[PDB]
Structure formats: C-alpha cells, structure tokens
Amino acid sequence: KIPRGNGPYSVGCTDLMFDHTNKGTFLRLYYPSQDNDRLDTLWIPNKEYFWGLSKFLGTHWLMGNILRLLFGSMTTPANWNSPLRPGEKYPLVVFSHGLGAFRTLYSAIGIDLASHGFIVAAVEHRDRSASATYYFKDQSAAEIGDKSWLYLRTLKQEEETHIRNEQVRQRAKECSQALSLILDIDHGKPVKNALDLKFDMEQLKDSIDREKIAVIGHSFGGATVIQTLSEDQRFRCGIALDAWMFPLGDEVYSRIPQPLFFINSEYFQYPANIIKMKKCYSPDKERKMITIRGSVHQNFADFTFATGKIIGHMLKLKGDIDSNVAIDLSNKASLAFLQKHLGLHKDFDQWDCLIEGDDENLIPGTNINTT
Ligand SMILES: C[C@]1(c2ccccc2)CC(=O)N(CCOc2ccc(F)c(C#N)c2)C1
Numbered sequence: 371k372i373p374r375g376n377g378p379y380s381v382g383c384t385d386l387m388f389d390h391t392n393k394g395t396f397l398r399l400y401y402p403s404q405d406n407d408r409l410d411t412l413w414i415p416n417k418e419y420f421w422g423l424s425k426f427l428g429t430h431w432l433m434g435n436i437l438r439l440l441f442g443s444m445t446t447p448a449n450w451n452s453p454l455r456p457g458e459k460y461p462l463v464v465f466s467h468g469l470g471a472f473r474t475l476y477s478a479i480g481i482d483l484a485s486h487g488f489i490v491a492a493v494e495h496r497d498r499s500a501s502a503t504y505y506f507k508d509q510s511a512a513e514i515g516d517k518s519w520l521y522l523r524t525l526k527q528e529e530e531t532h533i534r535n536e537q538v539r540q541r542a543k544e545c546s547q548a549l550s551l552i553l554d555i556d557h558g559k560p561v562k563n564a565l566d567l568k569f570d571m572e573q574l575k576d577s578i579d580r581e582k583i584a585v586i587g588h589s590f591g592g593a594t595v596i597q598t599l600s601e602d603q604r605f606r607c608g609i610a611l612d613a614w615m616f617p618l619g620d621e622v623y624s625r626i627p628q629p630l631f632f633i634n635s636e637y638f639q640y641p642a643n644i645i646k647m648k649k650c651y652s653p654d655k656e657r658k659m660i661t662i663r664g665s666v667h668q669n670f671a672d673f674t675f676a677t678g679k680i681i682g683h684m685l686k687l688k689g690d691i692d693s694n695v696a697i698d699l700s701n702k703a704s705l706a707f708l709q710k711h712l713g714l715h716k717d718f719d720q721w722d723c724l725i726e727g728d729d730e731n732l733i734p735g736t737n738i739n740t741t
C-alpha cells in the first residue's frame with residue numbers, strides 16, 4: 371500500500387487533458403479535497419501502461435499482461451473526483467516523472483503534498499520517455515474516446531546525447547505549458563477536459579496562490595526541474611529527486627537563478643552525475659543537497675510500495691531503509707524547502723533541520739567523492 375498523506379487535509383485526485391492532441395497537456399491532479407467518502411484512485415488505469423512497462427523492463431511483451439494481473443486492481447489513497455476544498459488559495463507544484471514512468475506513479479509524493487495544502491499537477495510527458503501515454507488524433511476521436519497510444523522510445527548509443535537533450539527540452543516545455551493551463555483555469559477560462567470525467571474545472575477558479583509555484587521531479591524528471599527553472603522564471607524554486615543529469619545541455623548549468631534542492635539516494639549516485647549537480651552551484655545561488663541513508667533510486671517512486679520487502683529488495687525497488695521512512699524524509703524536507711522559498715505561512719519549518727541532512731537517516735550533502 372501507498373501511504374496516505376501525513377498532513378491535515380483530505381486528498382482528491384483527477385485527470386486533465388487539454389487540448390486532446392499529442393501537443394496538449396496531460397496531467398494527474400492531486401488536491402486538497404472537500405469530501406473523504408469517494409472511491410480511491412486506480413493507480414495504473416489502462417492496460418497499455420503495463421504493455422509499455424514491459425518494454426521498459428526489456429522483458430517479454432506477454433509479461434505486460436502478468437504485470438496487469440499483479441498490479442491492475444491496485445488503488446492509491448486519493449478520493450477520485452472529490453470536490454476541491456474551497457475557501458483557500460493553494461500553492462502549485464508541477465511534477466515530472468522519470469524515464470519509463472508516467473503520470474500516476476508518484477502518488478506517494480503527490481498525495482502527501484496535497485494533504486499539506488498543495489495542488490500537484492503530475493505531467494504526462496509526450497516525448498516518448500513515458501512507458502506509455504495517449505491522446506486523440508483529432509476532435510472526432512476524442513468524442514468517441516478512440517485513444518492513440520505512444521510507447522517508450524529505445525535509443526541507440528549514438529542518439530543518446532542528442533535525443534535525451536531534445537527530450538528534456540520538450541519536458542520543460544510541457545511543464546511550462548501545464549503551469550499556463552492551470553493558471554488559465556485559475557483565472558477562469560472555460561476548459562473542456564478531453565477526458566469525460568465528473569469533475570468541473572470551474573472549481574479551480576481563484577484557488578491557486580499564483581506566485582507560489584515550484585517544480586519537482588524524479589531522475590529524468592530531476593533534469594526536467596533544472597531545464598524548466600532555467601527557461602521559466604514563473605517557477606520560484608525546484609526540488610530534484612535523485613536527478614539524472616545526462617540530458618542537460620552544457621549551457622543550462624550557469625543559468626538557474628532560483629533555489630534548488632537535490633535530494634539523493636545513497637546507492638544511485640556517481641561522480642559524473644554529482645559533478646554535474648555541483649556545476650549548478652555558484653556563490654550567489656541557493657543550493658542544498660542531502661542523501662537518504664540506505665536508499666535506492668526507486669525509493670522516490672510508487673513501485674517501492676507495490677511489493678513485499680524481500681522481492682522488493684531483490685528487484686531494486688526497496689533499499690536497506692524502510693520505504694515509508696525514506697519517503698517521509700524526502701517529503702518533509704521538501705515541505706520545509708518549499709516553505710522557505712515560496713514564503714508559505716505554514717508549520718513546515720519544523721522540518722528545517724532535514725534540509726541540512728541533520729537526522730540519523732540523512733547524510734548532509736553527498737556520500738560520493740569526486741576527484
Ligand atoms: C536513470 C534512469 C535511466 C536512464 C537511462 C536508461 C535507463 C534508466 C532515468 C530515469 O528517469 N530513471 C528512473 C525511472 O524510474 C521509474 C521507471 C519506471 C517506473 F515504473 C517507476 C516507478 N514507480 C520509476 C532511470
């Protein structure tokens with residue numbers, strides 16, 4: 371089970387696709403909810419995501435249907451289509467998924483943020499970095515619900531540099547586009563969701579704290595944070611969760627004026643990647659780094675909760691550290707940082723010490739030696 375949020379607000383969830391095309395925005399929204407008696411949210415909602423994951427895992431295609439059997443009925447603890455909790459303006463996080471992931475697989479993070487009073491928009495990238503995604507070929511196809519699926523692209527050694535960079539730039543653009551969509555919805559523009567879901571977007575009118583905006587993401591999503599910040603000053607700070615820095619162009623490193631927080635796992639990181647993180651550092655800029663003891667790359671994603679301790683450890687989904695312990699640390703430290711750099715008047719400053727990695731399961735900075 372994916373843990374419930376630790377904050378005082380109940381959490382809701384819905385999907386938004388606008389426009390319907392492959393150039394539209396697709397996001398999963400987590401938000402503070404009015405109601406708590408709704409059905410929980412289906413974690414991986416279509417079979418084609420399992421088919422996609424099977425390609426990403428490099429397994430036999432037929433394993434897709436086995437993954438679907440095993441995980442196709444799992445829910446995540448967010449009230450599906452619950453009304454938005456009215457009467458208060460909420461800061462906004464735009465969230466970027468890793469390679470071979472998609473919008474729904476970081477619900478532990480998104481739900482927790484929501485439960486503390488954030489709206490979270492988890493983008494689904496159309497760069498062929500998702501295991502799968504979908505859209506509609508045209509206006510007609512969206513009416514009858516005739517989905518077109520786009521699957522993960524496999525790269526040759528010789529495309530890696532170039533195509534990963536094209537992808538991160540598209541990702542940044544998709545993050546900025548999602549922001550603009552949400553900000554327009556806030557300023558009351560009628561948006562007809564391309565998905566026919568019982569959730570009126572008019573609810574979101576005057577409900578965003580328009581200047582309190584951050585971008586967060588895991589791995590490929592972490593590079594996406596950094597590209598996004600450099601391109602869009604509307605985002606006021608970023609949190610990169612175990613960032614994979616390879617996609618970034620040489621030009622971006624000196625061009626990130628906003629505060630940036632690296633939350634790393636112990637076992638993923640390596641000198642080449644850490645050196646790149648350190649190229650974001652500069653005497654005039656606000657930079658923080660911590661490393662979660664006993665953690666692996668997958669502690670930041672939902673599949674760290676989907677299996678038992680033993681097969682979890684074997685499959686590199688779980689580390690030595692407990693998965694709830696690990697995510698609590700990442701989520702609480704994230705909240706404190708956001709409070710500091712968005713200027714929120716909440717109680718997240720209780721976790722300030724975690725930004726400095728001052729905790730028995732934290733390492734200040736990095737464990738990786740670079741020389
Ligand atoms: C370093 C990465 C990489 C780079 C090149 C080749 C291979 C891997 C880039 C990246 O984003 N990574 C994280 C992928 O996290 C996932 C993936 C699928 C999932 F279902 C879930 C979940 N839950 C999480 C791995």
Ligand SMILES: [Cl-]
Pocket residue numbers: 640641642643
């Ligand atoms: Cl290295």
